């Protein structure tokens, strides 16, 4: 369906979901590093809901 489920689990980061569990195609979700963690400059900190109900890849960035 034209919707993705929960975004991937990134270690030491938490996504901002704004109170929802389902996201429409092209939805961009940004992660914030957890306490005692700082984002690594020049790294992706968000994912996007693409076709097939699949999220784009994201690597640990904290």
Curated annotation (Swiss-Prot):
Tree of life domain: Eukaryota
Tissue-wise expression: Expressed on the plasma membranes of all cell types that are in intimate contact with plasma complement proteins. It is also found on the surfaces of epithelial cells lining extracellular compartments, and variants of the molecule are present in body fluids and in extracellular matrix.
Ranges for domain Sushi: 3-62
SS bond partners: 4-49, 33-62
Record PTM: The Ser/Thr-rich domain is heavily O-glycosylated.
Role played: This protein recognizes C4b and C3b fragments that condense with cell-surface hydroxyl or amino groups when nascent C4b and C3b are locally generated during C4 and c3 activation. Interaction of daf with cell-associated C4b and C3b polypeptides interferes with their ability to catalyze the conversion of C2 and factor B to enzymatically active C2a and Bb and thereby prevents the formation of C4b2a and C3bBb, the amplification convertases of the complement cascade.
Similarity comment text for this entry: Belongs to the receptors of complement activation (RCA) family.
Subunit description: Monomer (major form) and non-disulfide-linked, covalent homodimer (minor form). Interacts with ADGRE5.
UniProt remark on domains: The first Sushi domain (SCR1) is not necessary for function. SCR2 and SCR4 provide the proper conformation for the active site on SCR3.
Disease: Complement hyperactivation, angiopathic thrombosis, and protein-losing enteropathy: An autosomal recessive disease characterized by abdominal pain and diarrhea, primary intestinal lymphangiectasia, edema due to hypoproteinemia, malabsorption, and less frequently, bowel inflammation, recurrent infections, and angiopathic thromboembolic disease. Patients' T lymphocytes show increased complement activation causing surface deposition of complement and the generation of soluble C5a.
Protein name per the record: Complement decay-accelerating factor
């Amino acid at each position: 369906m034209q919707d993705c489920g929960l975004p991937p689990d990134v270690p030491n980061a938490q996504p901002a979901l704004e109170g929802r569990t389902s996201f429409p195609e092209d939805t961009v979700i940004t992660y914030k590093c957890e306490e005692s963690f700082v984002k690594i400059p020049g790294e992706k900190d968000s994912v996007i809901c693409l076709k097939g109900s699949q999220w784009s890849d994201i690597e640990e960035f904290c």
